[PDB]
Amino acid sequence: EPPHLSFRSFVEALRQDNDLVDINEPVDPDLEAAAITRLVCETDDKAPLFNNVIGAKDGLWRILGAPASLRSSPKERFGRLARHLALPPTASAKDILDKMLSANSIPPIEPVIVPTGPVKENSIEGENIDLEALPAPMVHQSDGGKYIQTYGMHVIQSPDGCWTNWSIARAMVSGKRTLAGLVISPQHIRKIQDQWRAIGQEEIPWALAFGVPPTAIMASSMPIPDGVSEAGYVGAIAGEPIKLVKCDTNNLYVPANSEIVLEGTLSTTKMAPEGPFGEMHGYVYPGESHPGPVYTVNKITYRNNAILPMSACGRLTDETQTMIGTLAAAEIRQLCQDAGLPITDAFAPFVGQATWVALKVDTKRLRAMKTNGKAFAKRVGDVVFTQKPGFTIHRLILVGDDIDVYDDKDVMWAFTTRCRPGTDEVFFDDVVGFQLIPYMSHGNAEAIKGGKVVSDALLTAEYTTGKDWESADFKNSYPKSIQDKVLNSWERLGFKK
Amino acid sequence: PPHLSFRSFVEALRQDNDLVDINEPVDPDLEAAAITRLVCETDDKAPLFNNVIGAKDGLWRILGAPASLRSSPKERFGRLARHLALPPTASAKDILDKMLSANSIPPIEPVIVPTGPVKENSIEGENIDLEALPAPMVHQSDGGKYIQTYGMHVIQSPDGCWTNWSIARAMVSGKRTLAGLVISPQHIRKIQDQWRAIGQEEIPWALAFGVPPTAIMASSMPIPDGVSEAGYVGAIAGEPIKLVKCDTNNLYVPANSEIVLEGTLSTTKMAPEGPFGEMHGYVYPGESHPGPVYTVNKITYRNNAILPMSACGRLTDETQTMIGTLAAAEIRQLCQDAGLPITDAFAPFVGQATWVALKVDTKRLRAMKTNGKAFAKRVGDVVFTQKPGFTIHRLILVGDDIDVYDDKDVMWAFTTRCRPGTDEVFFDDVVGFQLIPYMSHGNAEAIKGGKVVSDALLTAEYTTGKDWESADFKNSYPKSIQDKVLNSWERLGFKK
Ligand SMILES: Cc1cc2c3c(c1C)C(C)(C)CC=[N+]3c1c([nH]c(=O)[nH]c1=O)N2C[C@H](O)[C@H](O)[C@H](O)COP(=O)(O)O
Ligand SMILES: Cc1cc2c3c(c1C)C(C)(C)CC=[N+]3c1c([nH]c(=O)[nH]c1=O)N2C[C@H](O)[C@H](O)[C@H](O)COP(=O)(O)O
Ligand SMILES: [K+]
Ligand SMILES: [K+]
Ligand SMILES: [K+]
Ligand SMILES: [K+]
Ligand SMILES: [Mn+2]
Ligand SMILES: [Mn+2]
């Protein structure tokens, strides 16, 4: 199977790309594996594969850190993400987001059932399971426990059986057979948990699949619509069905070539201290647990030589910024286009710590609408901040079509020179707010409400008569004949390539 | 000595390997400025144009990018550091500390010399033809040839006591005339208004190009009203600046200047000025505005004279490395004078010289028993009512875990610690900077408001203290683990 349909083939693709370090020396899953991963994320280095995790027994487990973080070569910066999606390692951010949105407008390709697969090579059951003895990583020194679940896919089905949701939500080892996880509104895993609580079910059938098909983990991180099963969406992205096998102990289905699967239940009643966790905004709060639902593990099935993927998230740049912000930005682009707004492109600039989305406006179509910045900013915020894909995003920046929204430097130039602070902003204090952001949960107002803005970084004339300025840069302030004369002279004169 | 002589500064750049000697003929119509602009956009070596097309009887060579950035992270500010007798590895803090060092010590008065290198050559009265000199065309949509982008205007108040040195742009306007930007609240405009008020038509004036590098830095710094830059510069340099008297008036110019224009600034005569590709990265084609006329009566110049040139615009040129960073230095000082607990200030490059980050001593802040809403309003009232605050539209207050000299730390604090709208105080009534496009070409008054203070201190920083740890390699892992990882890094196959 190709890299985008097999995690084991994806790992080999990273080896072929010279984008993976096989670490054969013993590495402690207590902080050492995550510290190496964290420093890889902070320097855009090669992904670390820990082949010799201290405490591994019977094939559980190796660790792959930084599965979807950035490469250091600017022409292949997003290459590890492109290898999730059957894209070349030179793929632009636009190419990656366009591919994730490609299934939005075409029929689902439904999964196919197979009788077995690699994930059934090994098993541990019932009283033989000891999660505290497995080498689950300690990801940050002040975390509330060992966060085994940072890059696996929760599988949970609605009571009526029609909707199977695949998503990423963190979970830590809680006990011999238990995890505690973050399960918050408005996420689909919480919506489904509430649908089971409402019919009185105490224990919901659940599975957690680690090292799924790379296309599946990307879709698991993307806010596709309510009621849409990710498996069919994944099939439409990948151009073929995902092969699923039935769980041993329940009626759920997991990818047949997953590395590791936990089968069990999600409680609708019981909670345990969950957290704290070093989180996508770059913070951990020592001692600050919150109650989270209990997952109970009844069976573990795994491949020979199983690999647990791990995201050591925090300050720039890891999977929380490369996947959560950018896939939110993709779905925000689709929301805006469905509303009839002239938005061509959306990205979550890394400088925004995945709380910003920049929206590129086709200014020719904006002028046909005969509106103004104040009215347009309100409309964009009403469309986006009332819908689930806008949940994590607190600042929308509207820029014209001379700005590359995929380039943090262009977005910052537009924001700081075209948006008059206060005057050119519309504040939203009645919308749902993201409580993980420290200015929300450790801030001056309600943790779950408000704190959002749309920043109009289009200049006044862009709404009426058009661009009346020229950039004071090499590209726009000098004739092409002068630019070419300089480029052809550059190295001969003694300037660098 | 490089901080006291522009010619010695150019030889210091040569010895740092930070200068390209360009001996091929280069056109001052857009080609010199295009090379400079690309140097500024890639942080490359300063270009010295030794062969300017149209050069006449020794006028002139051109030095581009005199205070732009070097690409090596360890010496990023080395070009600014050679203005100030600092090592090329000097931090931004070192440069700003040195510029503020003269705030708290006695001025070192300039000493007069009878002659100097600047008097080696001259052109006078009817022989002056500014239109035939190779003044650069700096941007293709500029309203004329911006001869003056890095020289020091010398103008004395009517009381005789206050001599101001300052950078303000000017373009060739005719055979003997420049037209310039002279706006409130800049001291060149304050002094022009003092002369108009007592009835003087033509104010004695000089413009010195290639001045002592310490002087051009102080020329770009909003030091207080009524303080002569010459004495401040002396106290920075730890010795007197040697001045010579102009031939045709009673003003004094650095004796080793490359080129001096002597003449008058009119209080009545106006001429079309601009547009000019400016510090925010914009030019508006066809948008000139009346500016005051400068009349040139005499030019004196060194043999092999060099005109310095700032090709300003998008990042990173002298307007970002000097205008915002020196405003931030003076904003730090103002805050400390008002008794606010500010230890450090910088103008992040991402802000396009419109942002200043202020680093708060949080131990001192907790001892004041205040809150963010109150403190943000108080800091804005102190800064946005004073001249050094003029160009700055956003102040970001950060705690003392944030390196305000590092744009990544500043954006991390701003995006994660300042709740949009809730944690911001907006200033609608203060003087605004009309050069910023969102002011001059925006939705409200060009000269009033559009400012904000962003409280990027978390709620607990005001009361009981920092209660998080960064989720980064340095703060989330014990020192024993960090060392084991750093000692293993290269051997395992990661990059240095
Ligand atoms: C890539 C990724 C996305 C995480 C994530 C992480 C990663 C690495 C972690 C594990 C490292 C930190 C935790 N994460 C959480 C999270 N969403 C959530 O509700 N709880 C979280 O704990 N997300 C986002 C979540 O996956 C997206 O919001 C999906 O759109 C949710 O799927 P749904 O739309 O089907 O609800
Ligand atoms: C380094 C530098 C600073 C410029 C400047 C430029 C540069 C290269 C240019 C030439 C490239 C673009 C023009 N500049 C102007 C300017 N201030 C001003 O009032 N008009 C301007 O035209 N400044 C800033 C000015 O020098 C500072 O605000 C000083 O504090 C003014 O001195 P003063 O405090 O004595 O008034
Ligand atoms: K999902
Ligand atoms: K605007
Ligand atoms: K000055
Ligand atoms: K705050
Ligand atoms: Mn879903
Ligand atoms: Mn002054």
From TrEMBL, chain B:
<keyword id="KW-0285">Flavoprotein</keyword>
<feature type="binding site">
    <location>
        <position position="169"/>
    </location>
    <ligand>
        <name>prenylated FMN</name>
    </ligand>
</feature>
<dbReference type="GO" id="GO:0016831">
    <property type="term" value="F:carboxy-lyase activity"/>
</dbReference>
<feature type="binding site">
    <location>
        <position position="164"/>
    </location>
    <ligand>
        <name>Mn(2+)</name>
    </ligand>
</feature>
<dbReference type="GO" id="GO:0046872">
    <property type="term" value="F:metal ion binding"/>
</dbReference>
<feature type="domain" description="3-octaprenyl-4-hydroxybenzoate carboxy-lyase-like N-terminal">
    <location>
        <begin position="10"/>
        <end position="99"/>
    </location>
</feature>
<feature type="domain" description="3-octaprenyl-4-hydroxybenzoate carboxy-lyase-like Rift-related">
    <location>
        <begin position="115"/>
        <end position="314"/>
    </location>
</feature>
<keyword id="KW-0210">Decarboxylase</keyword>
<dbReference type="InterPro" id="IPR049383">
    <property type="entry name" value="UbiD-like_N"/>
</dbReference>
<keyword id="KW-0479">Metal-binding</keyword>
<dbReference type="Pfam" id="PF01977">
    <property type="entry name" value="UbiD"/>
</dbReference>
<dbReference type="InterPro" id="IPR032903">
    <property type="entry name" value="FDC-like"/>
</dbReference>
<dbReference type="GO" id="GO:0033494">
    <property type="term" value="P:ferulate metabolic process"/>
</dbReference>
<feature type="binding site">
    <location>
        <begin position="186"/>
        <end position="187"/>
    </location>
    <ligand>
        <name>prenylated FMN</name>
    </ligand>
</feature>
<keyword id="KW-0464">Manganese</keyword>
<feature type="binding site">
    <location>
        <begin position="164"/>
        <end position="169"/>
    </location>
    <ligand>
        <name>prenylated FMN</name>
    </ligand>
</feature>
<feature type="binding site">
    <location>
        <position position="186"/>
    </location>
    <ligand>
        <name>prenylated FMN</name>
    </ligand>
</feature>
<feature type="binding site">
    <location>
        <position position="229"/>
    </location>
    <ligand>
        <name>prenylated FMN</name>
    </ligand>
</feature>
<dbReference type="InterPro" id="IPR048304">
    <property type="entry name" value="UbiD_Rift_dom"/>
</dbReference>
<feature type="binding site">
    <location>
        <position position="167"/>
    </location>
    <ligand>
        <name>prenylated FMN</name>
    </ligand>
</feature>
<dbReference type="GO" id="GO:0005737">
    <property type="term" value="C:cytoplasm"/>
</dbReference>
<feature type="binding site">
    <location>
        <position position="187"/>
    </location>
    <ligand>
        <name>prenylated FMN</name>
    </ligand>
</feature>
<feature type="domain" description="3-octaprenyl-4-hydroxybenzoate carboxy-lyase-like C-terminal">
    <location>
        <begin position="321"/>
        <end position="456"/>
    </location>
</feature>
<feature type="binding site">
    <location>
        <position position="387"/>
    </location>
    <ligand>
        <name>prenylated FMN</name>
    </ligand>
</feature>
<keyword id="KW-0456">Lyase</keyword>
<dbReference type="GO" id="GO:0046281">
    <property type="term" value="P:cinnamic acid catabolic process"/>
</dbReference>
<comment type="similarity">
    <text>Belongs to the UbiD family. UbiD-like/FDC subfamily.</text>
</comment>
<feature type="binding site">
    <location>
        <position position="229"/>
    </location>
    <ligand>
        <name>Mn(2+)</name>
    </ligand>
</feature>
<feature type="binding site">
    <location>
        <position position="187"/>
    </location>
    <ligand>
        <name>Mn(2+)</name>
    </ligand>
</feature>
<dbReference type="Pfam" id="PF20695">
    <property type="entry name" value="UbiD_N"/>
</dbReference>
<dbReference type="Pfam" id="PF20696">
    <property type="entry name" value="UbiD_C"/>
</dbReference>
<feature type="active site" description="Proton donor">
    <location>
        <position position="278"/>
    </location>
</feature>
<comment type="subunit">
    <text>Homodimer. May form higher order oligomers.</text>
</comment>
<comment type="function">
    <text>Catalyzes the reversible decarboxylation of aromatic carboxylic acids like ferulic acid, p-coumaric acid or cinnamic acid, producing the corresponding vinyl derivatives 4-vinylphenol, 4-vinylguaiacol, and styrene, respectively, which play the role of aroma metabolites.</text>
</comment>
<protein>
    <recommendedName>
        <fullName>Ferulic acid decarboxylase 1</fullName>
        <ecNumber>4.1.1.102</ecNumber>
    </recommendedName>
</protein>
<keyword id="KW-0963">Cytoplasm</keyword>
<keyword id="KW-0288">FMN</keyword>
<dbReference type="InterPro" id="IPR002830">
    <property type="entry name" value="UbiD"/>
</dbReference>
<dbReference type="InterPro" id="IPR049381">
    <property type="entry name" value="UbiD-like_C"/>
</dbReference>
